[PDB]
Design a protein around this motif. Structure first.
Motif, PDB file in Angstrom:
ATOM      1  N   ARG A 256       0.807  -1.225   0.000  1.00 36.88           N
ATOM      2  CA  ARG A 256       0.000   0.000   0.000  1.00 36.88           C
ATOM      3  C   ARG A 256       0.842   1.280   0.000  1.00 36.88           C
ATOM      4  O   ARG A 256       0.451   2.279   0.622  1.00 36.88           O
ATOM      5  N   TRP A 284      -4.608  12.709  -0.992  1.00 38.35           N
ATOM      6  CA  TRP A 284      -4.407  11.378  -0.405  1.00 38.35           C
ATOM      7  C   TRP A 284      -5.224  11.195   0.873  1.00 38.35           C
ATOM      8  O   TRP A 284      -5.957  10.216   0.986  1.00 38.35           O
ATOM      9  N   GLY A 287      -8.910  11.029  -0.055  1.00 38.34           N
ATOM     10  CA  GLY A 287      -9.230   9.738  -0.643  1.00 38.34           C
ATOM     11  C   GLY A 287      -9.362   8.646   0.411  1.00 38.34           C
ATOM     12  O   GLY A 287     -10.332   7.865   0.410  1.00 38.34           O
ATOM     13  N   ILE A 288      -8.401   8.604   1.327  1.00 38.84           N
ATOM     14  CA  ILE A 288      -8.445   7.600   2.409  1.00 38.84           C
ATOM     15  C   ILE A 288      -9.703   7.783   3.274  1.00 38.84           C
ATOM     16  O   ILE A 288     -10.424   6.825   3.549  1.00 38.84           O
TER      17      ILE A 288
ATOM     18  N   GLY B 288      -4.617   7.173  -2.416  1.00 38.08           N
ATOM     19  CA  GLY B 288      -5.219   6.982  -1.093  1.00 38.08           C
ATOM     20  C   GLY B 288      -6.360   5.981  -1.141  1.00 38.08           C
ATOM     21  O   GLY B 288      -6.428   5.020  -0.331  1.00 38.08           O
ATOM     22  N   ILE B 289      -7.267   6.211  -2.077  1.00 37.86           N
ATOM     23  CA  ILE B 289      -8.460   5.346  -2.224  1.00 37.86           C
ATOM     24  C   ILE B 289      -8.016   3.916  -2.502  1.00 37.86           C
ATOM     25  O   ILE B 289      -8.473   2.978  -1.832  1.00 37.86           O
ATOM     26  N   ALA B 291      -5.312   2.409  -1.786  1.00 35.33           N
ATOM     27  CA  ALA B 291      -4.606   1.838  -0.639  1.00 35.33           C
ATOM     28  C   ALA B 291      -5.553   1.168   0.381  1.00 35.33           C
ATOM     29  O   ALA B 291      -5.116   0.322   1.161  1.00 35.33           O
ATOM     30  N   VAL B 292      -6.830   1.539   0.385  1.00 32.34           N
ATOM     31  CA  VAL B 292      -7.764   1.129   1.445  1.00 32.34           C
ATOM     32  C   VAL B 292      -8.871   0.240   0.846  1.00 32.34           C
ATOM     33  N   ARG B 293      -9.090   0.602  -0.414  1.00 31.41           N
ATOM     34  CA  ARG B 293      -9.986  -0.057  -1.365  1.00 31.41           C
ATOM     35  C   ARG B 293     -11.426   0.312  -1.151  1.00 31.41           C
ATOM     36  O   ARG B 293     -12.047   0.879  -2.054  1.00 31.41           O
TER      37      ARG B 293
END
Ligand SMILES: OC[C@H]1O[C@@](CO)(O[C@H]2O[C@H](CO)[C@@H](O)[C@H](O)[C@H]2O)[C@@H](O)[C@@H]1O
Ligand SMILES: OC[C@H]1O[C@@](CO)(O[C@H]2O[C@H](CO)[C@@H](O)[C@H](O)[C@H]2O)[C@@H](O)[C@@H]1O
Ligand SMILES: [Cl-]
Ligand SMILES: [Cl-]
Lengths: 291, 293
Positions: A256, A284, A287-288, B288-289, B291-293
């Motif tokens: 990741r 980022w 998005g997370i 980011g998206i 990475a977390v899915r």
């Protein structure tokens, strides 16, 4: 942004804070010989999405100057105490230089604290001098060998202020304006004030020494390679501690981990790429948090 | 490395720019009027390290084919759908501006499962009155677009005078484009008749219920956008053109999972003033998206 001050372990740490506080926390961690000053043009780009906190390490910037050794483990204790004092229960970490060693070590000891790690120009155990900086920077290797030499390092850093006056500008592509360079100088008016700046290169984990830092950072790096939180690695060209080629291999060695290419850059990437870094970090985080 | 390619579509062809690793999520970049994939040229290199970027020229624009069609909104819908099928794209992030946003919203309303996320700016919405078209300090823009929509007058301005390319375009960019940057905006449109799609677009804008079919479609699309659960990224300039900063904050706060990114001084063609900021933002967001899915 006002500089604020927190009581920490009977001393104090200065910090900059910005952003709505109903948002996730992002801790920005500088290294040597900088302060929260280095984040000044990045914070306004991240504050719309996050509660930004950028402390000055003990003995750096506007923080207190206790009469301590300023070893890596001393910074660990002060940073831990600052986080506790601020009431922060989880955060994104954004780090450069020695800030990355603090971040990695924090993540290793508290995996559930870390929402994500954005890093650049990071510290890793370096089995030989060939692993410190790149082949076009033999002269940097020679300077740090001197920093780590008794008497010589004192003359260079404490007396001559070489880290602030030579290493710092040498790690930025552009020339800082007077008003941008001045806050790098003001924390370090005297030889004694420069103690933490000398302590840090003597903590660099090179060729097994110092053994305690070398082992802690091996352990932190093992934890990082086994972690599942999102990671964002920035690289410059040619960089300094991290080459573009090493960055690609390193990022692929993790899970990741995205790699963002900034272009012409040395060690203090924030100074040459503040807008790219801030925009990248804010996207980022957005998005997370969305998912 | 960024390649320019051509796909056969509905008996004609669409040109597209493509870059990035084939094993990464797809990102579809959608331009509006009177631009082409040229407008994304400084953004693509910033997103390609994290995604497989595909930037088509809409039918009748850029280096795409110029078939004998009306170039209404629903024609663009059909050609874009056929392009997506031809490229075998099964899901994508959408990055869009202007008429690109109407296409993206209409696509997302019909196929929400296709949408990995939507990054958008300076977007089209149903506008009950002319007061809802641009900000009250730009009365000049409303008069110009009223004239575009007027039979005969629009032909003279857009087809004969090339006003959309020569005046409207630079008018929505804060900086002055270099000659080498402006030239590829002109080359798709050498003749009055080649400008037909450019004239068709302002006449499709959903203002005061006209045209009824587009107005209805964009109402339905906006209702879907308001309820949608996919990640969204809205960019705004100051003062903006179709979207004021104040409108943007209220609009973003109304949606689910929508981040607002403030770009500073900007008008309508925000890509030309803020390519770096937009590219870096979109790349970090996708990273980011995913990475977390
Ligand atoms: O895919 C975009 C971007 O996301 C990262 C993590 O930030 O990787 C994720 O997505 C990849 C493609 O779907 C997966 O292979 C990977 O396992 C996942 O972490 C970046 O590495 C990538 O550039
Ligand atoms: O939180 C940062 C940023 O993320 C967004 C979505 O991109 O909101 C998400 O995060 C919020 C805080 O955790 C949540 O309350 C929200 O539901 C979630 O969508 C942006 O709105 C925000 O600026
Ligand atoms: Cl150091
Ligand atoms: Cl139009």
């Amino acid at each position: 942004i006002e500089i604020r001050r927190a009581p920490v372990l009977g001393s104090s740490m200065a910090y900059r804070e910005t952003g709505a506080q109903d948002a996730p926390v992002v801790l920005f961690l500088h290294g040597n010989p900088t302060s929260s000053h280095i984040w000044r043009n990045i914070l306004p780009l991240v504050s719309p999405v996050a509660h930004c906190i950028a402390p000055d390490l003990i003995g750096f910037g506007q923080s207190g100057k206790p009469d301590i050794a300023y070893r890596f483990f001393d910074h660990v204790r002060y940073l831990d105490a600052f986080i506790e004092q601020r009431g922060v229960t989880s955060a994104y970490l954004v780090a450069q230089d020695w800030g990355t060693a603090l971040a990695f070590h924090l993540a290793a000891r508290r995996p559930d604290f870390v929402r994500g790690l954005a890093f650049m120009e990071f510290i890793r155990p370096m089995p030989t001098w060939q692993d410190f900086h790149q082949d076009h920077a033999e002269a940097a290797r020679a300077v740090f060998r001197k920093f780590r030499t008794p008497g010589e390092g004192e003359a260079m850093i404490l007396e001559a202020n070489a880290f602030v006056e030579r290493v710092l500008p040498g790690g930025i592509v552009r020339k800082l304006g007077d008003e941008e360079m001045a806050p790098y100088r003001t924390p370090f008016p005297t030889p004694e004030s420069r103690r933490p700046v000398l302590a840090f290169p003597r903590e660099l984990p090179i060729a097994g020494e110092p053994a305690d830092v070398y082992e802690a950072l091996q352990s932190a790096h093992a934890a990082l390679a086994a972690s599942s939180y999102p990671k964002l690695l920035f690289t410059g060209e040619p960089g300094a501690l991290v080459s573009p080629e090493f960055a690609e291999r390193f990022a692929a060695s993790l899970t990741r981990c995205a790699l963002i290419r900034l272009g012409a850059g040395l060690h203090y990437l924030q100074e040459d790429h503040a807008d790219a870094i801030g925009r990248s970090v804010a996207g980022w985080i957005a998005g997370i948090e969305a998912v």
